[PDB]
Scaffold this active site. Sequence first.
Site, short mmCIF file in Angstrom:
data_model
loop_
_atom_site.label_atom_id
_atom_site.label_comp_id
_atom_site.label_asym_id
_atom_site.label_seq_id
_atom_site.Cartn_x
_atom_site.Cartn_y
_atom_site.Cartn_z
N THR A 6 0.84 -1.23 0.00
CA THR A 6 0.00 0.00 0.00
C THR A 6 0.86 1.26 0.00
O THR A 6 1.94 1.28 0.60
CB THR A 6 -0.94 0.04 1.22
N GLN A 7 0.39 2.29 -0.68
CA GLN A 7 1.05 3.59 -0.71
C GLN A 7 0.17 4.71 -0.18
O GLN A 7 0.68 5.61 0.50
CB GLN A 7 1.49 3.91 -2.15
N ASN A 26 6.18 -2.60 -0.83
CA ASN A 26 4.74 -2.50 -1.03
C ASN A 26 4.05 -3.02 0.23
O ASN A 26 3.33 -4.03 0.17
CB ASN A 26 4.30 -3.28 -2.26
CG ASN A 26 2.89 -2.94 -2.70
OD1 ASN A 26 2.40 -1.84 -2.44
ND2 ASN A 26 2.23 -3.87 -3.37
N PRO A 27 4.23 -2.36 1.37
CA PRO A 27 3.74 -2.92 2.63
C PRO A 27 2.24 -2.79 2.77
O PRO A 27 1.58 -1.98 2.11
CB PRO A 27 4.47 -2.08 3.68
CG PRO A 27 4.63 -0.76 3.02
CD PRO A 27 4.84 -1.04 1.55
#
Lengths: 238, 215, 103, 213, 243, 273, 245, 239
Positions: free
Chosen positions: B1-2, B104-105
């Site tokens: 997530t961004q 892309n955590p």
Amino acid sequence: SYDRAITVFSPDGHLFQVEYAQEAVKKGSTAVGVRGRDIVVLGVEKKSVAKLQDERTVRKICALDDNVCMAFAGLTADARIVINRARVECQSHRLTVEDPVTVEYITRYIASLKQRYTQSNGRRPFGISALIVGFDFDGTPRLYQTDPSGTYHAWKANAIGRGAKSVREFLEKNYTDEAIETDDLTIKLVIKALLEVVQSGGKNIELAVMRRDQSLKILNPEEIEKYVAEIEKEKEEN
Amino acid sequence: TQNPMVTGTSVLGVKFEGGVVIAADMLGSYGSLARFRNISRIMRVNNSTMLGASGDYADFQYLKQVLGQMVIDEELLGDGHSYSPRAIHSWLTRAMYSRRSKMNPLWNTMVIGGYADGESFLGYVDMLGVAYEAPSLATGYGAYLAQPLLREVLEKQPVLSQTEARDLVERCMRVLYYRDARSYNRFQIATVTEKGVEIEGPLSTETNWDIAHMI
Amino acid sequence: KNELLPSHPLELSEKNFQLNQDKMNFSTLRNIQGLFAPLKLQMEFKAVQQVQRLPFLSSSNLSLDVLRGNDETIGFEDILNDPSQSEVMGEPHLMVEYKLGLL
Amino acid sequence: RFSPYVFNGGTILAIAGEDFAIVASDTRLSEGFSIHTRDSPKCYKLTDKTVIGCSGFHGDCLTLTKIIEARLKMYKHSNNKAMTTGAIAAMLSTILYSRRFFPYYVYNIIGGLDEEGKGAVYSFDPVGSYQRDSFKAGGSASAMLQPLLDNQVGFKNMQNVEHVPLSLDRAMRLVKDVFISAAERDVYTGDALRICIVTKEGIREETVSLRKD
Amino acid sequence: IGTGYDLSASTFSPDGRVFQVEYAMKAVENSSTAIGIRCKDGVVFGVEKLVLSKLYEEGSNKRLFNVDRHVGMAVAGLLADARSLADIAREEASNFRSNFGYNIPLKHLADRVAMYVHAYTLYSAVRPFGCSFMLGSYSVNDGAQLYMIDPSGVSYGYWGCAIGKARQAAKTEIEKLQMKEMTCRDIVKEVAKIIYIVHDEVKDKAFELELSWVGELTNGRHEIVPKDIREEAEKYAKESLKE
Amino acid sequence: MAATFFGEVVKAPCRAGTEDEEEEEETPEDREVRLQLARKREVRLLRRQTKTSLEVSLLEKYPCSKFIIAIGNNAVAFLSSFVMNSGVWEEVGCAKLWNEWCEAFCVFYHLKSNPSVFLCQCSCYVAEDQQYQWLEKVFGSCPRKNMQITILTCRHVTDYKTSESTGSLPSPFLRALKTQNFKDSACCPLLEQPNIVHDLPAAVLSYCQVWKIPAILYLCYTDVMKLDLITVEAFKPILSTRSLKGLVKNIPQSTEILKKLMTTNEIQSNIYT
Amino acid sequence: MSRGSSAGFDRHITIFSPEGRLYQVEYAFKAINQGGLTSVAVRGKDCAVIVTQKKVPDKLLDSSTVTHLFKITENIGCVMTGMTADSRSQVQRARYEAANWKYKYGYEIPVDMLCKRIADISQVYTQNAEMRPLGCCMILIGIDEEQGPQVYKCDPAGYYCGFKATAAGVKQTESTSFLEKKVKKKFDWTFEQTVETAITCLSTVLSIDFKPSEIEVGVVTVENPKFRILTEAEIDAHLVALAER
Amino acid sequence: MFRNQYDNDVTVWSPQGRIHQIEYAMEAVKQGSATVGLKSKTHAVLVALKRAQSELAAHQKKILHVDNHIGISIAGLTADARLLCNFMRQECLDSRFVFDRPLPVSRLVSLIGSKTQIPTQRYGRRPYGVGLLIAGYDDMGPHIFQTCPSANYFDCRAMSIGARSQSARTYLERHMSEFMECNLNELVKHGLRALRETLPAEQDLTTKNVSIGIVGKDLEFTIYDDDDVSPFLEGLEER
């Protein structure tokens, strides 16, 4: 059958396709090379003096590098492929290591390539035997012989191709330290061996001379005929 | 997530004698807007494990799907083994660390409760992969507002009862509602014990505004 | 090496355009049809690609195009640069060995 | 944006001896200005003759410890023997340099007995470089702890002093004092002090309470 | 007879028969009988699981698989292929729940697995699966659904069927059984009776009866028959066989 | 049956071996090498004692009344354990041959007390094209029709064909096959109808049947073949009966110890532990 | 092929016969015959009808699941004759191709294009060695916007021709002869007329009078372009009408 | 007679409906040495009869470590056995790395079954001609699992595989009830007696040819060889 597949082992334990590649090598023209003190010389017996053919395009002795030479006996196309690969590897080694290529290194590379082609049954082995001869970094003369199987051996004097056995007996009988000492002696020895291989000799002699710190040079038919005349005079004296 | 987008406020968990209790609000905020005011940020992993998340709700749903699928498959196997809460905690830690390493955590901070083999488990998994077990936990503004009270009570009385833990969690929820702009009046109490995971319905806090008139 | 980092954000996408399209088709079939369709198409593609010219010679891949549905579709990929007019060709044996996985 | 690393604090320290290898660390896990938990020892025992301390980013520390345990199991399965302290140090250096362009934010100190029964302390940097020392301190308060270790254990800047061999009790007292000072002056240290003494008999764990924030 | 056409699954016989698929069917026939009867409340399975040795723990080589919360699987033929196809079905159902959010219908799962088997029979690199299985499930909307898949790759729903050595005898017993009007309990009792009837104690020394069912009484969830009910069914089968 | 590449045309092998003949059906070099191979493969019967090549057949030179032939490591081990120590057996003749497939020797023994009784410990393999040559060298062309031949060999349980599976079968079991003239009790169940023997024992038994020589063939089927004590234990019933009753004396004790000696000195399978 | 190319001319799909025939394709046709059923499709000026015999072998077998009438898209339906599994695979492939055509081109795939794609895939099968032709036959029906009703049959060899009256199965030749006789006598070819023609053709070639449960009929009309499966009651009504006249 | 065509390959079905290559792999595992594996209510013991190529050559090991709680007994092909052991070790390491818990034995056996099933269906691959007796301890207690060259696996209370293993299997089946409820030493002695029953009457068990692997509740998998198996051999009754 056992003799059709390269990977299949025969009940006795043979890889008969490698031996058939060796037979194909034996079918080739005789190639003879001896080792001497600061002098390495090669000689290949031409199967026939085919008229209306350029001798330059069908040469059997080539120079892998400025300090390494090679002669082959077997399938010509396979020999050309192996020679190109060996030259590429020699240049790659001179790039990565910066040192001149040793005869051992290129002989090992050629043997490894042949063995790798013997690995799979999809690829047929290279049907050539090569006589890699040259000088090392220190200038020590070196003569080597590879086989389609992938085994390389150092020799003081060797012969490959058709009639290899008789020429090998000739060399074993007539190999002396005195002959190695004199470069002309080694050249005369090779001329005598090839003349034993082929009675006609003369124009059929394809001899190349490499000396210490000197690039490979092929003696013209004039010099070959001069050496043949010297051998004939020596024989007549006896 | 961004982009966190719809986010969660905070999850508070505390372990008592007989199990663990966790609480979370029913609000998902886009920015400062409330928008979704009936979502549930607590899931029942299995009969002895519970899970609450704070952060991107889409990532929470993705984790819900994955964990539910793993539990379903393991139940199908039917070999007599169950995912202990510690195993789920380790798996979540590994997944979060891998996602972080891939740049892309998953933007959720996860609180894992459970009660297996007569042992209360309370785990914390962060976005990056920071994992640890504590008697009390709190994410987001919880760590600043509710964690003080929980830690004070626990260091005073090491072990609480179910009623004491529930009352303390309710007080913490009241404090968070008072002093957190992203909080919501409705919350969800979830408790796991020997019987199993029991998730209570929407509960509201006892608001007090006498200080408004005091001035 | 720095070559791994794409020079253009679109470069990585369009370089593997055919691979990505096949992956998307497999994903859609597998979502809807099931495991059988992607596996079937994978075996079919492997079979058609297994028979072709050697690497140093440009292949037509007619059966592959028919199976992939591109036999009647033309994109920039087909026209802009011709694999036939490579302008760069390695040693035949070297390319064959590279494809075989030896190098 | 997204920051893959955060500093979770923690201070590690290892002292080597003739027949002992003390590996001590605090139990303060603190991210930002808050305290995550008051019970999180930074020292993990690998074998019966090796204990490793990890400080810095907690996630990287956990992943590295798990990888080290897996590699120890692989080595035991392959070579049919337990890895030695020097071998563990070399393997850890290789592992750390493997992720060179995404470095582990872990300060690693390996302390344990060698094949001769002598305490061996290996200090590591995030990149992977390491060397053998007699004593070392790592983490947030490494700069605070090191000078006293040099003064006392190394007997540096001490003119006309007796170089008494470092005994076990003196080492424990020194460790307790240095960590008390760190808790006094460093906000990332306190709560408790986990001391792992690696001797030929085994590993002994001692907990000493430090002053809370 | 396809003497020179029975070596590859990609070769047609002059009459148009792929003999590898038929040999797979015969391999399925080599196995012990597994029957499954569908009734109004749900589907009940039952397998004549032969015990090869007393050393094996009870439940070894289980022929009943729970491919999904609501889908059972009674297998016959080669056990390894049965396990592989059970795993394939599990992946399919997992994937359907993950994508569409609801349990996969029995018919769709049967179609997927049958097409997988057919794809395996298509090529010469792989060989046709040597197993046949029964997929059964019960739902409040879909209702009781029972499906059988053949190594060829067919998928036909049944009110009752059998696969294995004594396939025809079990089929006749199910034919003379009126499944559409009985409950799950009577159905499991009759399944045990049929399994005991078709078992040949002479050729086969001994067997263990494994019973599973999915239906309303199980809340649309496949599970093994409880030990008490299973023992009652075995006792009823013993009494029926005695008379 | 190559399948080296994708489109390789493979041909189904023929169990009758026709394809070999079809490929077979000249050049002087090919004929010369073929004759070299033929004389390399032919059996050469000679004796190491005094190095006197035995051009004359063994049967013609000495008159035999009881010829016990053992083929296979287990059979020769059993004979070495039981019959040698009972009396005295000196070497007389030894067939030497070379095969593609391979202590491989074919040594013949004769009893000093009764020279008419002979022996043969054929621990080596004989190819399908050499059993007849071996029979020519040993028996010659004119037989005696007065010889008790007991052929001993070991086979594998997989070779035996029956409704029961190989595993279910009791591994240490042995069968018998006797000629028409051999009217003595076989002491063993006769071989099943579909079962066939296709090795040197078969050649010897067929030779005996054709020329009316009383002979019996014993086949000890066993799961293991590398110097197994159970194989010789199952062979013991053979000496328990006639023929080999007098040759072996009433000293099982030494034979039992002797049989252990052979089994201890054995080579295990590196591939299969 | 990975296993290896077969030896005989008729033992492999790729290698040719001395005339140049491919015997494996002919054996695939023999497999289509081996399917055991017969399918008849009739094209009118108002609707297209496909009729095939439905044979439920066992009472335990659920007759609802036994069907050879499959819908590719909402307006195109097909009847498959031959191996059941191969027919199902071809049906799935046709469904996927139609959906992809709709997604990519913005309008529903024509029947002719659907069979063209199927026949191209079949040709790919017959050309390579690894795969084998599918032992089944596809008959597609549907109403075109401009050409009206369309009937196309779609075979293993890769022939995708369109027909005014298609037959496939064991009795393909006799059904084809009967349909040629009927077509030579050009009637009005109304909906019920086409249904009667198909049913009576099948009955004549099979020498049996069908009851409602022995056949399955699928229709698609210009007024109602959606592919419709005739209910057993409607099939019984058509059979009664046939019996009366 | 008529099965020559269908005997060569594993992807070719015989007219009777049986693949002969799998049965030949079973023959290969039978041809290997004998191992005995039995479990009590608290321990799982693997006793193997090691074989030495020659008197000078050391006995080849047949008990291999897999995890802290799982071990195997070798029988059949050695290369396939090593490949399977490496695969199982990797699976156990992955389980302990992800879930931080020991991998249940049944899950590992199912994974092995699938892995060994994959080749039997594809062309150009042969079945793993190795049989394994897997001893492990889980939350359910001791486990003994028999893996055949055919991908199917079995759950057993006591099993013997290899050459001359029928006598060992008979002995195990004779005293199953004794096995279930007995001391660890009694269980090891029972396994040794079964292994002896496999051996010829003349031969006897020695410290060189006996390898023992034991896993229990509080006991990890430990392999005993020579002087380590001497205590178990001591006190054993005469055959």
